[PDB]
A paper describes a structure:
The CrystalDirect system enables the automation of sample mounting and cryocooling and can contribute to closing the automation gap that currently exists between crystallization and X-ray data collection.
As an initial validation, crystals of proteinase K, thaumatin and lysozyme were prepared in CrystalDirect plates. These crystals grow from solutions that typically require the addition of cryoprotectants when mounted manually.
Numbering used by the authors: 1 to 206
The structure:
């Protein structure tokens, strides 16, 4: 499956793509404002994620740091990134279909649209100004709006017992972005697409 990752932000981002224990394609790359990076993701990838990283520094070897979404200091991510990270999430070729969503379970850093480029399902978008509106207790000094699990480390925010409900903090993300997951047991906003669809993730779509 091909994913075209497009940076429509006025600022440079460093895209990242991983299934948690491995890079997807190169794993990461710089995208200046307006640049497009096409990656190939193996069919049947389960639990894949694409995100943006902000305010990164990398040396010649591809090691450094990002203010948001840092993946162990690597340009070429092989693991998931450090919150806050708006997440484009996908499991492909799962019994004939692909499944896509946007999640704010790990916070929000950059606005995102995640849409098919092929026929047969709709896209999802979280493009509201979540950083600017972020509750004070969730604001990431590094930049971004953390989720409440990251900040407070409770069973209720992290849904550790599988019994949690919505919270004042999850309802903030949900209000700004109804089409993204706001907490682990949120009513799903997952979209069913044709198996072997192709996609585009646009940062700052508006």
């Amino acid at each position: 499956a091909t994913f075209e990752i497009v940076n429509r932000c006025s600022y440079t981002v460093w895209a990242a793509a991983s299934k948690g224990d491995a890079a997807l394609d190169a794993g990461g790359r710089q995208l200046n404002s307006g640049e497009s990076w096409t990656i190939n993701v193996e069919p049947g990838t389960n639990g894949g994620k694409i995100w943006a990283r902000t305010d990164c520094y990398f040396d010649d070897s591809g090691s450094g740091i990002c203010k948001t979404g840092d993946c162990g200091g690597l340009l070429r991510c092989k693991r998931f990134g450090r919150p806050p990270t708006t997440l484009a999430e996908f499991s492909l070729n799962q019994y004939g279909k692909d499944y896509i969503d946007i999640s704010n379970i790990k916070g929000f850093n950059v606005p995102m649209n995640f849409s098919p480029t092929t026929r047969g399902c709709r896209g999802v978008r979280c493009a509201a100004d979540i950083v600017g509106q972020c509750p004070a207790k969730l604001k990431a000094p590094g930049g971004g709006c953390n989720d409440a699990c990251t900040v407070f480390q409770t069973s209720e925010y992290c849904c550790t017992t599988g019994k949690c409900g919505p919270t004042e903090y999850s309802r903030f993300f949900k209000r700004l972005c109804p089409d993204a997951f706001s907490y682990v047991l949120d009513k799903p906003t997952t979209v069913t697409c044709p198996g072997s669809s192709n996609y585009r993730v646009t940062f700052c779509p508006t």
